[PDB]
Amino acid sequence: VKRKREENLKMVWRINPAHRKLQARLDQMRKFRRQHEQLRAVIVRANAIEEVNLAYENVKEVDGLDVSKEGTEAWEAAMKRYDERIDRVETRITARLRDQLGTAKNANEMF
Amino acid sequence: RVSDEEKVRIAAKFITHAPPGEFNEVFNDVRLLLNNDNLLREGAAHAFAQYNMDQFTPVKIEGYEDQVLITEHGDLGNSRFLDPRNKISFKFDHLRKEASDPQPEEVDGSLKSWRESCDSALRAYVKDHYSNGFCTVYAKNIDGQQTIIACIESHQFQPKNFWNGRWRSEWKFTITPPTAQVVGVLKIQVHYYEDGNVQLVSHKDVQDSVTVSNEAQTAKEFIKIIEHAENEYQTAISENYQTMSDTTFKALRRQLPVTRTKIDWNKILSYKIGKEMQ
Amino acid sequence: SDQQLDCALDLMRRLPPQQIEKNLSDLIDLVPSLCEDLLSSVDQPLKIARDKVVGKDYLLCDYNRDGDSYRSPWSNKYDPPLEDGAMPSARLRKLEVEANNAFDQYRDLYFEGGVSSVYLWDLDHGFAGVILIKKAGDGSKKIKGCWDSIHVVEVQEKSSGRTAHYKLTSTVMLWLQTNKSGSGTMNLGGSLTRQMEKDETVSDCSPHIANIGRLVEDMENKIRSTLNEIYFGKTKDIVNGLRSVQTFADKSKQEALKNDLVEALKRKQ
């Protein structure tokens, strides 16, 4: 463009690929399996284990050849469903964990 | 580091080539460019001397008040000039008219009596016929020949509209008995600078010869010849202006096209008028 | 510096410009600290330019010059040959060839010689350029001079409504080296400086070039008229005023009787 040396040029570079939309659902899958990895590494220390299991089942095995059309369109709501299984579990853990661990007998009991 | 010696010739060229009226002011501006008077006066003194000697710089002693002109026939080189009419030797400064100590010298003085009536009739005509035209006739008995030296200065320096102009002319009636000669040179330097440069410079230098008769005959003879030649050439200058309008302009910048009427630019833009016929 | 710059301006204002290069040398050898933008203020003469890859004459100026490499509109090349050939709009380059062609015809119409060169470029919406006409005092006449027509075409090219703007800056140097016997050793001359503008709804039949030739020619005529009238008569005014050929002892009484006539006018008014 610069070696052309024609006149006052107005060319504005427009760079945009088509795999961005596919990358969006792939990124949702990234975060899905990532936070699920965190979930199975968290569930040890017990009904939440089976809760994460059934949630991960009902949301991972409905990927539908991970096409971003239905991905966004309906699987986004399915991911929201996964957030509610997970969000609810997290809230429950936080509420009772706070009330129990904040009521330790002594420092050794706290440990 | 430039050598300041070059600036001496720079300011000398500036002084010498300075038109009258446009000299002291821009000369001071040249000093502002130099920021020194000593460096300036290294060559500016000799430049002052000769630049005034040739430009017929007006000088006027109080003892005679003839409004003499700075030349070489009164000059002594020690800032002391002499009267071309009553041979007084007197000191005379050049950045102003500071003149003092009149000392009447002595020479053959015959020619002085001749140029008295010569310059009287001449100066009478020049005063009564030229506004600022004023002359001074120097006299010198060099090489056994009397010399009638006519110096005419004429100016009007009011650059309020960025204009100046001055006339100078020197005519020598070299009294060489029996046949004396009519020698002479003109000097023109006019300048206008309000949005446009105007540098008018011209002259005419001629010489004739005729046998000496007496004082009156040769006086009216020489002055009449120069008089008519100047009026004649002044008329020629007017006609030269007439030659400008028609020849000069159209010799360089014409006024009309080949059809002498107009120019169709779109016809130049296209049509190819017939550039392949002949 | 600043005061010295003002001194140089008055200097050049009163200096004889037939020594522009030597006077410029005096300016450098006198004040080299202000050797920065000498010819920016100081007006320059024109310079000959012959193309070699093409073999056609062109001109040397500011905008064609690239550092030290002048643009040849015959080949559109920078001389000394550089790979720094920053050239403007090629379409406008060809249009410039047509413009300079028409103006070479124009100079062959009103001048029959010299070289015309309007070196332009291509700014944001508009642009500018320089009109260059080099035609000195031809050897055909002993009366000579140096015709240098330097003008600045300033096209503030608008877009909406096929309109544009124009602004002409002007200057034409020339001397009057008339040293004939009837002229003695007559020499006069110089250059002027004027400007004008325009806001034209520029159609296709009358391009910018047409406007250039038009108003430039008009300006030249105004200049020529101004010269021929004001300056020539002005000089003659000073001539006849200082060195007159009019015998007095008459004008006083005649004008006195004329004033008596004015008195008679007042006697009824």
Curated annotation (Swiss-Prot), chain A:
SS bond list: none
Ranges in coiled-coil conformation: 18-41, 72-95
Localization in the cell: Cytoplasm, Cytoskeleton
Family in the record: Belongs to the dynein heavy chain family.
Subunit structure: Homodimer. The cytoplasmic dynein 1 complex consists of two catalytic heavy chains (HCs) and a number of non-catalytic subunits presented by intermediate chains (ICs), light intermediate chains (LICs) and light chains (LCs); the composition seems to vary in respect to the IC, LIC and LC composition. The heavy chain homodimer serves as a scaffold for the probable homodimeric assembly of the respective non-catalytic subunits. The ICs and LICs bind directly to the HC dimer and dynein LCs assemble on the IC dimer. Interacts with DYNC1LI1; DYNC1LI1 and DYNC1LI2 bind mutually exclusive to DYNC1H1.
Swiss-Prot/TrEMBL domain comment: Dynein heavy chains probably consist of an N-terminal stem (which binds cargo and interacts with other dynein components), and the head or motor domain. The motor contains six tandemly-linked AAA domains in the head, which form a ring. A stalk-like structure (formed by two of the coiled coil domains) protrudes between AAA 4 and AAA 5 and terminates in a microtubule-binding site. A seventh domain may also contribute to this ring; it is not clear whether the N-terminus or the C-terminus forms this extra domain.
Main function: Cytoplasmic dynein 1 acts as a motor for the intracellular retrograde motility of vesicles and organelles along microtubules. Dynein has ATPase activity; the force-producing power stroke is thought to occur on release of ADP. Plays a role in mitotic spindle assembly and metaphase plate congression.
Protein name: Cytoplasmic dynein 1 heavy chain 1
Parent-protein start and end of this portion: 438 to 582 of 4646
From Swiss-Prot, chain B:
GO cellular component, one term: cortical cytoskeleton
Top-level taxon: Eukaryota
Subcellular location as annotated: Cytoplasm, Cytoskeleton
Function: F-actin-capping proteins bind in a Ca(2+)-independent manner to the fast growing ends of actin filaments (barbed end) thereby blocking the exchange of subunits at these ends. Unlike other capping proteins (such as gelsolin and severin), these proteins do not sever actin filaments. May play a role in the formation of epithelial cell junctions. Forms, with CAPZB, the barbed end of the fast growing ends of actin filaments in the dynactin complex and stabilizes dynactin structure.
Keywords: Acetylation, Actin capping, Actin-binding, Cytoplasm, Cytoskeleton, Phosphoprotein
Chief localisation class: cytoplasm
KW DNA damage (keyword) present: no
Keyword presence, Acetylation: yes
GO biological process: one example: barbed-end actin filament capping
Chain positions with Phosphoserine modification: 3
Family note: Belongs to the F-actin-capping protein alpha subunit family.
PROSITE patterns: F_ACTIN_CAPPING_A_1, F_ACTIN_CAPPING_A_2
Subunit organization: Component of the F-actin capping complex, composed of a heterodimer of an alpha and a beta subunit. Subunit of dynactin, a multiprotein complex part of a tripartite complex with dynein and a adapter, such as BICDL1, BICD2 or HOOK3. The dynactin complex is built around ACTR1A/ACTB filament and consists of an actin-related filament composed of a shoulder domain, a pointed end and a barbed end. Its length is defined by its flexible shoulder domain. The soulder is composed of 2 DCTN1 subunits, 4 DCTN2 and 2 DCTN3.
InterPro entries associated with the record: CapZ_alpha (IPR002189), CapZ_alpha/beta (IPR037282), CapZ_alpha/beta_2 (IPR042276), CapZ_alpha_1 (IPR042489), F-actin_cap_asu_CS (IPR017865)
Protein name: F-actin-capping protein subunit alpha-1
Residues the record lists as N6-acetyllysine modifications: 13, 91
Organism: Sus scrofa
Single GO MF descriptor: actin filament binding
UniProtKB/Swiss-Prot annotation, chain C:
Function: F-actin-capping proteins bind in a Ca(2+)-independent manner to the fast growing ends of actin filaments (barbed end) thereby blocking the exchange of subunits at these ends. Unlike other capping proteins (such as gelsolin and severin), these proteins do not sever actin filaments. Plays a role in the regulation of cell morphology and cytoskeletal organization. Forms, with CAPZB, the barbed end of the fast growing ends of actin filaments in the dynactin complex and stabilizes dynactin structure.
Protein name stated in the entry: F-actin-capping protein subunit beta
UniProt main location, coarse: cytoplasm
One cellular-component annotation, GO: WASH complex
Compartment list: Cytoplasm, Cytoskeleton; Cytoplasm, Myofibril, Sarcomere
Organism phylogeny: Eukaryota, Metazoa, Chordata, Craniata, Vertebrata
Keywords: Acetylation, Actin capping, Actin-binding, Cytoplasm, Cytoskeleton, Phosphoprotein
Residues where N6-acetyllysine is found: 234
InterPro entries on file: CapZ_alpha/beta, CapZ_alpha/beta_2, CAPZB, CAPZB_N, F-actin_capping_bsu_CS
Alphabetized GO MF terms: actin binding
Entry's family note: Belongs to the F-actin-capping protein beta subunit family.
BP-aspect Gene Ontology terms: actin cytoskeleton organization; barbed-end actin filament capping; cytoskeleton organization; regulation of cell morphogenesis
Assembly information from the UniProt record: Component of the F-actin capping complex, composed of a heterodimer of an alpha and a beta subunit. Subunit of dynactin, a multiprotein complex part of a tripartite complex with dynein and a adapter, such as BICDL1, BICD2 or HOOK3. The dynactin complex is built around ACTR1A/ACTB filament and consists of an actin-related filament composed of a shoulder domain, a pointed end and a barbed end. Its length is defined by its flexible shoulder domain. The soulder is composed of 2 DCTN1 subunits, 4 DCTN2 and 2 DCTN3.
Origin superkingdom: Eukaryota
